[PDB]
Amino acid sequence: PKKTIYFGAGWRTDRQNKAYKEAMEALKENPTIDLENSYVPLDNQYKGIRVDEHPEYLHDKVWATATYNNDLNGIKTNDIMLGVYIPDEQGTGLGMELGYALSQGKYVLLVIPDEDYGKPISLMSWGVSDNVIKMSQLKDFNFNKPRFDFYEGAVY
Amino acid sequence: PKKTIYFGAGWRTDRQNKAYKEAMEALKENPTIDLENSYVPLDNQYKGIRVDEHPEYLHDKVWATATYNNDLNGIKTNDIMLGVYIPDETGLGMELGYALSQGKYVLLVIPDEDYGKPISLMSWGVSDNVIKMSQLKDFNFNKPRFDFYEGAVY
Amino acid sequence: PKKTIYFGAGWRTDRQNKAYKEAMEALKENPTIDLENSYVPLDNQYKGIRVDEHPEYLHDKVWATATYNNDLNGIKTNDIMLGVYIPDETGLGMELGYALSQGKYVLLVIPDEDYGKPISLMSWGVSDNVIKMSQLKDFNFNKPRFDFYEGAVY
Amino acid sequence: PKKTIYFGAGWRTDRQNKAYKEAMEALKENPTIDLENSYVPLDNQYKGIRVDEHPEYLHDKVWATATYNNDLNGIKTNDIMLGVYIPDEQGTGLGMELGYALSQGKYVLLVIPDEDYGKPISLMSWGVSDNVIKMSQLKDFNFNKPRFDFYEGAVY
Amino acid sequence: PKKTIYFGAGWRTDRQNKAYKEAMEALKENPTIDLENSYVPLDNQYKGIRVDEHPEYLHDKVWATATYNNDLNGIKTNDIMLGVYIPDETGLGMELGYALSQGKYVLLVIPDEDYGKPISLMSWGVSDNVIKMSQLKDFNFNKPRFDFYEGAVY
Amino acid sequence: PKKTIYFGAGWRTDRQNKAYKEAMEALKENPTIDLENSYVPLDNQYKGIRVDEHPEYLHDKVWATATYNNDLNGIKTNDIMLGVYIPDEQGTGLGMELGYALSQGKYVLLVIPDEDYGKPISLMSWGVSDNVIKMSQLKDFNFNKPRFDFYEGAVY
């Protein structure tokens, strides 16, 4: 059996982009993930509109509403929530997404790159996650038998 | 005629501390807020012990379990959720998300000198309303309503 | 000793308007209802603009987004959900359903001249209690309880 | 992969019945719906009791409780919520069902017959739905990748 | 400054009855509890009829449907959920679980002579706080907080 | 299609143990249960720690937190909630679990051993369950089409 995820991961900084690629690749290799039917936000831009070359839409309340609703709906309609957390950039963005997944009854799984695993994560991130793994365990993670654990590191 | 709040605000950066003081002072002046009976996270850290003062507790799971639970309980047992949002720079998203799931009015307060700046799409969407810090003292928390942030999203 | 409500009632048909006036007048007389601080949808339409008065806004998504959110926020931030139910004839089911999910007491009020008539199975099942309009002025909203509608279902 | 739905659709008026048949047929043809394991209310009458030739049961609080609980349980235990909405008959009945599906974290999908698509829907229906499609798009709808959109028409 | 509760306590065993009386008397003395407007299950049995007094109703589904719904409505429309827990010996777990899902502060009260004894893991985990019976009269229900039971789990 | 359950069942008394075995066996034989990917608590002890030969951990708040969170997470991440209810031992333990499953939108199914079926169950158990069956119907129970019914017996 397989499972679909919401790809909670930012694409705005060097280290976010590096973590993104690594997590994408992690999931292609994992036989318990159905990546084709997962929700990856960048593949699901509203009406194909690219905010980077069309930033006028950042002032458009309809676009904002559509995008927001689509991401939520992406969390709500998939099995597992995936949070690529960058401890140094204090995991900024996915807080709300992680919180919404918890409210919808999803397994919330934080993945941290190995270079950063062990660094201090926020109390709320530690508390909201059902498990926190290294990037390199993500490929061999069994999403059919997801269990609870604590992060082995500091919590600020 | 008096609502209680959860004081969702950080205390690490200079900006954070300055917004923290302004908002707390605002809440004291608001006759529709009952601050004595509100939850302020700094005063409710497990065993009355602040991580920043005793970093010992960075690696203590009883402390982190207890403090996390105390903060959730502070959101759920109070009427309104307040988020002091500094757009240029938290842990706030999960607090905001938890409030939303618990049926609370979610109010973001942004310092006057930052109001207008782009806030994150999820912050924008999870909030019921978004105000300036100089408005917090007069906000009627007995008639809380939806409104859109006067600013863009990123 | 004072609860606030969400005033779930339509204002299109003659019957709807008549039940609307009767119920509002009842709520004014009820000393356990705090009507000043209750949410009445007609007074909280986005930009203070009523669709029926300015149908322009039928095709405005900002307006519909904002007004929908305002009504949800009116249900979730108030104590009780009130549904003025006209059995012979809304949008009320979703309001009722949202209240149920938010943990609110769901009270249906049916005009005396219609009380006894069949209500829909889902209306029947989602409601915590079902009363006559002439009872609304004296209902104790501080001790709200479950009871079955004295009537059939369809 | 396939998905199960709750068949939110009334059977009481001419145009409801016509929309019912069209939606049933839509789903048999859609390869992403598992219609055998979906919940269709009329197939799930309590103890096989036909209210039309046995209306005495409309005064029976036990029957009412059973039926109500079964429909909810039908929404709760399937993947997607399906609402056949008749704009002219102001979609009366499914409001509560749509609201309950939203509370259980389901994709809520309104289908309107093409003859009526574009006519004014209620604010709450517009707001509660994750998408609103024409009857003829229902057969080719991909329930494995359900996304958000707005209704292209009036909202009253 | 006054919160209402749901009085989650059994009345079958001797111990249950003794804890029932102690807790009710405690709640009367607590100036932060509004007991008149609280839900006490024994006083809200369907048709004012107690199963133990009229076991006739053991086999009545209208009665069981109505009483179950009334108890859920008593949890959801009140501020705090109270569980009188007798560790040596309910139906209480589902009441506790329902409160948790409804966003209520969950307080367990254990008789002084039993406090220290092992409570079930799920009781331990679902509760926001766990106190002695002799503390109930002075508990500040306006500032309810998380704390760990001073005792083991089984 | 198959479904995963949470095995809500105690292992502390003679009659609980007998009911446990019977329910385990019931599920191996049921083709609509995927028992390999279900959550059975005893197979999911935190860090393999056996409380019976290591009861020091009963005073360990971290172990308690881990275990509790794992069981919840077991309910939340499976399809159906299964409650092996012993009417005589007044079904003590699963109340919270049953309540949590109801809050997460799960079908809650009580199974009672045939010897005890008909005996008085608690109001809350009766009210929280979507159905109550005999142990011997559990093998032939179709979890792909779970429906509502009342318990045929006393409710105290």
Swiss-Prot record, chains B, C, E:
- List the active site: 95
Q: Which GO terms describe its molecular function?
A: nucleoside deoxyribosyltransferase activity
- Gene3D superfamilies linked: 3.40.50.450
Q: Changing residue 95 to A does what? A: Loss of transferase activity
Q: Name one Pfam family in it.
A: Nuc_deoxyrib_tr
Disulfide pairs? none
What's a GO biological-process term for it?
Answer: nucleotide salvage
Noted pH dependence of activity:
Optimum pH is 6.0.
Write out the catalysed reaction.
Answer: 2-deoxy-D-ribosyl-base(1) + base(2) = 2-deoxy-D-ribosyl-base(2) + base(1)
Q: What class of enzyme is it?
A: transferase
Functional note: Catalyzes the cleavage of the glycosidic bond of 2'-deoxyribonucleosides and the transfer of the deoxyribosyl moiety to an acceptor purine or pyrimidine base.
Q: How does it assemble?
A: Homohexamer.
What is the protein's name according to its record?
Nucleoside deoxyribosyltransferase
